[model samples]
Target chain A: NIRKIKVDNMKVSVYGAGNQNLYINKLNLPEKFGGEPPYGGSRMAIEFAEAGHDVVLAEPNKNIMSDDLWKKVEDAGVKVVSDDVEAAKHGEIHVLFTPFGKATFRIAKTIIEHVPENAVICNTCTVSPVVLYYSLEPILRTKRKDVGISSMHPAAVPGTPQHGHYVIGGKTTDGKELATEEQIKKAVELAKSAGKEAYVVPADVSSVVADMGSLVTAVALSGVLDYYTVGRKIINAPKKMIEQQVIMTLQTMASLVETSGIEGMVKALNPELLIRSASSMKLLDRQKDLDAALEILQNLDETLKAEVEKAEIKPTTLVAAQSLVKEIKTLIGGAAAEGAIKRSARKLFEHADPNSSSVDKLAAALEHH
Target chain B: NIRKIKVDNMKVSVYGAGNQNLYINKLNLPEKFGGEPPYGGSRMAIEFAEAGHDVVLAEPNKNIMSDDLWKKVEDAGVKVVSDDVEAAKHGEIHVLFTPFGKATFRIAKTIIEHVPENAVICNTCTVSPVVLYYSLEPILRTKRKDVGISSMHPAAVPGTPQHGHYVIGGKTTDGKELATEEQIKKAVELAKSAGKEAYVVPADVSSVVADMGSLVTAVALSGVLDYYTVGRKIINAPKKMIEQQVIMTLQTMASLVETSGIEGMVKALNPELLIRSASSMKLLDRQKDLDAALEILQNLDETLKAEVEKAEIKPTTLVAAQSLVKEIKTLIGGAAAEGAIKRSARKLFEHADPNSSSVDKLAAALEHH
Candidate 1:
């Protein structure tokens, strides 16, 4: 019976001792989402330790939670370490329950070299697993091939009953492996050992699926579905054509947001133009999505509209991104073409092509090849 | 006063006769959108001819519309030319009314060499002007210095009252020139001559503001506005932090949609995670936007849900998109750093980092630099 069990205990190191003030006072999580104080990383540590895993929590701020909370963590058989390096050497799995922004990346880089071989680093909602992987990629490729990148996102608050599942980052949509199969399976075991359901989503997509902004993801998706249905069933446009339009719309907005923020993006997209173009797409009854959208765009808060008017629309290179990539690949033909495509991608993702020359230069690179 | 006006009629060439069946029958635009039979390219030609411009209509297929429709086009005194090259040589301004997909690029390439000196070629919704510029860059940079690229997007069906303005692509967010100042102003003149308002937006963003899929733009914008209001006024999160989160969310969603279709995107961005994350964000009353979003994501059509469940999430590279761009720039330092940043952008845009070696290589390149 014991041999029938797939896996048992494992070493897990968690960064961040959950902030007590924000959770208890600001969020009122004790009453709302139904959890006690110290409801994040510390809670995750307690759960893992109780599940028989060797858990060490690295928190520089000893004052992050109260003395009672520390006692609770210690009572659950979890090791508490003030130094990140001390904890870094302790766990087979390192979970960054770190803060948002630079702090997360800085901690990941610092601890990565110290962690043992075959150790897997996981990200919470604070930073995307893909970004974490990219940041540490320098050390990861040069000295730590055995190291794997993954996520064990407590998609909900760690201590709440709602935290019944863990979203793990597995193979990407393009079919690249972020973490090895064994490494990923180990993460699943860690989640299940704590009695939480494990869902291994693509590494790149985990943030939108699991993060707070999934609200935008959901609303935007409904509108897309509505447009898709109308385009296909009623207007009978080609599927590829409709998809191209969708890509153009979404990609432009994303790029604008990346470079210009929301207001600048709004100013550039120009709601007045949006209203007229989208009106022709209103073909169905009870088209609540488009109706609500039209109403909102047509009547932006007066102050916000003024800001949009005054906001400078940044220079953005508009193109059908994927189509252009494909077009150049065909135009150049071979590794030279592939190289051009690669540069274009970086130019776009890195915001490196502010000059609008990358696409043209990339294509030129192909011609000589 | 009219005779004193200095703006004179200019020679214009319009391509493609427009799909008559789509506007007149399928969309029922005469009653529904208040547009007549020839609502697209041909309509633009009719309007331009009516404005006393020397206009030429180029259509390879005479049967795209009825004989009656052909008569209407001729009655407007617009010269009809079946050969695109002929029209290409005739006008100071050439408009592409070409079909969707690669056909537009193919036609543009075909005509660029034949057009006279200093002729400005304009794109409608079929392609981005940036793309057209990239496609024709080889010729433009060397022999065709006289050539210019811009857009005169009707932004609505041309024959409809909704077609009150033209969305012209001008400067970009990052301040790059897609077309000359003279070329852009010429487009404005053309639009004004037709008695339509002209809005010069950034070249990269005209599509989101002008295309049919602006439905997605408007809807997504509403969600962003809603979240911005709540995050600022209620949660009191830092503006930069909120914007970072917004960029991450929107970029993740857009990339998912690009790699996978709507169904696959839905599968990747699970609505369950959405409901929970967004629920925590409900810090205020009358949050109707989030309420509607929650209702929609919670109860997707059963059949759609099943497809979503079965959809294969493609490889996606999720990150705090802008932060990563900024981080790398600081890491590498100066011009040397800029080179590495450019490659990373390409790697991301092309989805070329499945091997995850590009970042390491670029970083190595930085060290040598």
Candidate 2:
């Protein structure tokens, strides 16, 4: 029944034993979403080992899972090691299934020096491949030029029924190739070996579509698109006008969130006012997204609504980002302008320092003006 | 505390009687939001008349309100007319407080030819000034070059205590001036005369912030901004990468909605699956937007959820719009490329012909490539 395609067995190194307690006990995935025990990293390692690939699982915390689960992983022929360096030295394709934030970066740094030549480093749920590459960029550029960066993101919990596909990061939307074709092919082959569908998305966008936040992405997008359609078709507005509103709306929200967090942003936006404003946009016959969104806004949790009422909307300079970008490009017309633009963009996206405020960040970026 | 300022009492014309049934009966705004009867356009006319401006109220449908409500308008010394042209001839500042959709455009078209010289046409509530300007552009450019377009948008119901301000449309974010300084000043003066504060937002964005859809816009924008911050700060991703994802997510959703409606879009993006994916994005200490969004997605209406479950995701070609735009600009370069980009953008935002599918619209736009 299987198609005859000669695929080489991959020596896969998986870091961290996935949080089984979160999947099984906290989420009740087995009963709620239907996933077996020993989920996440260990499940991935087990599957790789069972597919006739030599697999090594490095776990610093033995307490992450029970002894019985570790035994199950070992029974699947995955060589269990307490040391990450040992696993780093063993595999051609390295998968980081580590904790979020600093832990993942720290582990990647530790193992990079020991990994074999042509080793392709991959990220799972915890971090984006773009971030992993950025964190490892110094080494990758100076020393490990032969090595590659990509993602083997399951796009779902590894042991769950939904985890039937692997979202692989390919060339970026801006055309940056983080991984070589051969290295990417190997990741795809590894996924196929475990009977999982391989989806190669733009490296930069992998997290958005693959991450848990894709839910928010999907719902929010529906609202935007609904507005876009209504604004353009029903209202017969200019394309530039519609895009401007989008930029203003999104930039305003982003700035508010950056300065004031969600409660303040909600307070500033006023869901009640928004509902009244947005209700009139029902120009089409079947605007179900608007219909659903209206109901959601109307029926917000009373306690949360009260909290939102008490929240304050700080002083925010509402500017259309793309418009500002265009203005800078036109006025400055050189690298200096791009420098300011990049800094402004970074200010918008980057985490703020404790001493600095969003206003300060924006002001500093606009100091040239 | 009346300030001595020489303000001319201008002749004003207001169209439509407003939906009092919707305000007092359906929305229960009289009790719930604290608004009285004779709301909307009729209220604006009554206020303008009381302010010593020669005011005319145009309503073809006498059945829109009872004899009591009609008496209220007449008692305020406001001239009531059945013909739009009759009111159109009376005012130097004409306000189209007509119904949404074709009715508003129809009234505008009927009145544009008969309006006084240098008369400024304003919109409130039911339509965007941008759309109104666009609808009247052909006539204004040729026959009525002296005419200016602006807004007298009562952000809240005219009869309500919340109606303390008017959102006037000025130069757009993209720098298109639909209304002259004098015309815009007159609208502001008119608003101030009615004891309402005037807010001059970019004409293009007025609808987004002032329309009922702003709720969706606000919620969706919060999600986008959240992702932008997380992708940049927490994930340490490139700015281009994050923006690319934003564009993709929004464009994809827009395309899906353009093709499949909200039910199909929801089915394509399974809320249950989204919740699982987005749960992992709790990278920060506080993401109340995500928290609220998660709850909303979780507790969707039962019947809607069932409908979403049965809906089908139509054939969608997921493309990052900005990337494609860049590719086209780089490949084609100059006017031809701009033409293609504009067409493609139009294709994205414009309503599809009844015979055309989304894929076909996209394909036709890409034919130049």
Candidate 3:
């Protein structure tokens, strides 16, 4: 006979019941991925409620889901409210499963003042916890000393079988803690309470490993690793040389994307040239990543290939990122340097606006500094 | 009617008769990539000699190729020399098609003292012009200021029809010129004389787009551009967020490779988890890169996967590389900071020694500073 441990239920508030149409109608997650009707924030709300937490869901839009789905959410014992403030005042932990961009920032800013003392706010997929902390920093530093920022990123859709883990934002790699130890503990506890494994990743790095774009991260990493092995083992190249190439390749690609967008980046890199070049790297007996990449490059969708062929390689200044940072710091060694560094970092990682060119933003930061 | 431009022929001395066994017997370039025997240095010598340049082929080890290959090289109006000094004294342009690692550095150092005034030393696929310049920096800064360093990277096997172009190292993106404009112009003239197109790229960035490892660079870049498209168009992610992810992914991979080698990097970045995470990002009509990547990850060679599963993920301190550079500069201002930054940059891009761990090297640099 096994004895069950006593469970402590905490109050949880979730903002913006997720877009069910995306899950059910567009994605067809129910049939394809084995999930029920509501598969995002609403599902998160329902799960928390079912796990015996007092859950309040704030959704300004009712037509986001049908009556049947809303009935399921209510049946799971989740209190439904239209006003964000009502939900803000209800829970010790607030999960912003809101829209992307300014809407998430707006909701975060709106609720920071209304939440309870020592309350911790969590970001889901829409916003990074780092960006969220930055957005709320002014208030966080002054008025909301008791408030904490963290992430409860569902690495997968909330209701899906794949959603067995919650990636919680912990201390950053550089030793900056967005939330206190107790606050981070609460996030891990909440994840455990919902029968999900909790992974505490560096706050700044959480998005790369947990986001939808992690697919690219995973694939690109595989390629880099493949080259590293071939360079070191087969070619007997120096480790430093390999690292430099990796840095040059990636930094160049990222900068091109920043200055030129995807088509222009492709046009500049030239997949045909890439195939010819990379084919030589098949020094190993089997390089699945290289094989796959070659096939993909060779058999690109014709229309897409045509678009790439037509795209112009834009004027890109390809500099080693770290070296540039060093240059900036050395050029102006003071608070101004720090500002420029921070601004450029933001330009690379958290540009909220799309209209401004990244190269211009970087150049302006350098010029100003 | 097209008129032939008068070509200015110059003395060109090539080091290392080329690794014929690797090209002919091992890689089978003639069958696979359509290059004949003596596919590297000697082939370069043959081509230059045929282009009406005074060419001397140097090989301390006559055993590198068959006597027939040497005969073929000599038949092309090339003067074959057993000693490097003999060839070093013969040319206005010295091309180091020497072996990778210490040998390339050794030969470069040995010949720098002997090469003619205003002679341009060029690196082929074996070494980067930046590294070559750095290896010979002290001499060039003091005794050999008249000599210049640049690249004559074939970007393909010299004997192959694919070798229709040369990638020449030009002014660096950070505005460091390794070779003079006149020297670079001479390299272009030499390439055109051989009927090969010449592409000028940043000195620091040449190896990535021109070397064999360019395969990895090209493939990884395609994946990044793919994600950029999907992240911006499909997921409506912020451009900054996408770039941050790209940087984090690539930088993390590079660092991991630096610290733990390829197997350990793979173990740390669990491919299974990546597939599941990346699957949700397939929101577009066609993403061949993603599609291929998913398949590659899903069907990784079982033995390789086993090795990855068994590999240990070493202790890693993940930080935004640029931010760390800033931190180092800010923490130790003035000359101390500059020294630390340069050493760290060198550690990343020019670690000639493989005996020391990269992490230890970086940590030591920081601690000393």
Candidate 4:
């Protein structure tokens, strides 16, 4: 039912993990990174090509056109192209598999420049709609009145042969915006070909969805690793101990895929100085291994410090080590905050108050350092 | 003059790389990430001690302090204490180095509880002032009514100690928000002895100043590494190539730092990516040559596809030949976006999107592998 159902001029284009094939007339782009097999695009194209219209898959590497990758396309009877935008521009296209980042823009720009007038561009990259609407769509509009651009960034990788969620933003001279009836239907039509579901995003925040999508993945990595690091380093248990600790940690995280939901990595940072300092003490006490305990304690104190130093910070110039030598003329002889402040203050701020200042000028110099 | 000037009441704490002693009194919280050795409690301890006031240098391991680190401190020649407050409570004192954070507060509380009523509490760590104010003043008001609680966060780390910066807040029990002349002089005196200078930050924005100052160093590190990655990879140069590449990158980044001061580590989860990737790529390109490149390209596609699958970022899920089956499904198969979206969307919303509908939920879920 899913495969046989076809619309006129329907051309399918495969995209990332969760396959959403927007059927269009022509296609282009690499089928693999470099001699790799075709992925999302290949899978979707098979269904479309078999469905009986011209189908093309654009891949990143031209080398992927090898017989190794072509065998599948040849078997499926789908046309494949190395030049993505060139293929999309051949006529009125209804599909796309644009990825993400600066590269996606470069590809889209190329297609917009060459594609035929009235070609409907189905953007399948993970870029923000704001990026598309402003970056490519406007270029399409200002560059050529013939092209219609619609953006749809899918939410998942392919599971089985057929499903995923999608966030779509569509527009033409008519201004339907991908959220409209026809627009959404078109978006879902692509998903249905693979036997998947399609959901429309609120018109205003499609990019917000895209952006948040990326940010969360990044933060999750950080948060997850933060906790995992501690678990990885606690004591010399056994060969399996570290693995089991990690596995247990992963399991704990897995239950929070809800992010503290029943599955997701736990949220934490290392050496919460206040809490961990105490926690380390307790753990150390339990271990009763004096050498190890001291080592870890000392290690913890310095580890946090080193990580901090690995960042952007400086000590107050007026109060650094050299300052101690100044005021204590009788002891360790070195620069004091006062003398430095007096000279530098006079030089930096010509109007610096000599009498009205005690250590105010010296303290202020710390800001500069 | 800069190096020779004697600054009083200054103590130094050196730490090994990648350990915990890194937190410098929360004076620069987020920016506390990569930094010059921070001088908080340690700096003040030396200054107060040099000023002929009783002082305590609360630190780790009376039995086993790092010789290299203590040398930097004792070289400053000042009083040291195990329990600062306990020492202060025993007799007269002028200044206190209460570093930043909750532990900082706890330590300050300990000192306040044990110190004499006439002792002044000078915070050296960088952290939220609201916390510092709320934590320490209570102890001073109830027990040591005549004593003062003044806070200062050093602004920079390296170079000559200067003045006209730092967040200084806290007040006498009389409800006067500003530090008294006596307090200012004492702050300067303490800063001077610590081999640093002081600045008077307006009470209202002290926290912001502290936070900003703390983050600067990390930001500086980020700027350096961000460009470093591009040079390393895009230029395809080895670590040895970094001298010219790195210096050039640093010059460019230094310009930015010159303007922006500094920032905490940007941590786009990319530095490690660069380090690992460059190490891997260079090893492939240089060590293995074309076959290695082919092997890597092939494998990268798979790993990337796995990432896409794990991340559920299908549609144009990038992959190599080695990752064909998983890649194929992820690129264009049904529900491909589910894994990618599920993985990615969760990430985005975990931080980026706080509120969303099921549609957003679905989009996020689609990135699921």
Identify the candidate with maximal TM-score. Answer: 3
Fnat per candidate: 0.49, 0.14, 0.29, 0.00
lDDT by residue for model 3 (A1-369), tens: 011213556889999889987778766778767878788999999989988889999999999999999999999999999988888888999998998767888888888879998899999877778778877989999999899999898988889888888888887644678999898998888888889888777676677677876877767876776787778776676666776667657655655555556676665565665666676677777777777677767766455578876766555544455554555556666797666555554444452552557797899999995
Which window of 10 residues has the lowest lDDT sum in candidate 3 chain B? Answer: B1-10
Q: Write the per-residue lDDT of candidate 2 for residues A9-115, one digit (tens) a residue.
A: 76899998898887787666787667678999999999898888899999989899999998999999999999999999999999989986567888899889999
Interface Cα RMSD in Å, per prediction: 6.1, 9.0, 4.4, 23.8
Ranking by TM-score: 3, 1, 2, 4
TM-score of each: 0.75, 0.60, 0.79, 0.35
What TM value does the first chain of each candidate achieve? 0.82, 0.85, 0.91, 0.47
lDDT at residue A35 of model 1 (Cα atoms) = 68
Q: Residue B44 deviation, candidate 1, in Å?
A: 2.4
In model 4, which regions exceed 4 Å deviation?
Answer: A1-4, A7-9, A13-37, A50-53, A58-62, A82-86, A89-103, A113-120, A124-128, A141-181, A199-369, B1-127, B130-369
Tell me the lDDT of model 1 at A294: 74
lDDT of 4 by residue, A1-369 (tens): 644564444554433222222111111112211222344456556655765656666665644344555577768777666666647655355455544345556666777677665555565534434334445646655676555555544433222221244445543211235334554565566555545445443322233222212222222222222222223343222322222222222221211121111100101111221121122212122222222222333444454455443432111101111111122232212454233322321221111112435476678887867
What would the per-residue lDDT of candidate 1 be over residues B8-127, giving only the tens digit for each residue?
Answer: 568999998899888888788898878567779999999989888899999999889998888889999989999888998889898988886566777788788789878899999877
Q: Is the docking of candidate 3 incorrect, acceptable, medium or high quality?
A: acceptable
lDDT of 4 by residue, B121-209 (tens): 55443333333444555555576676655555544322113222333554321134534566556565555544554545433223222
Best model number under lDDT: 3
Best by DockQ: 3
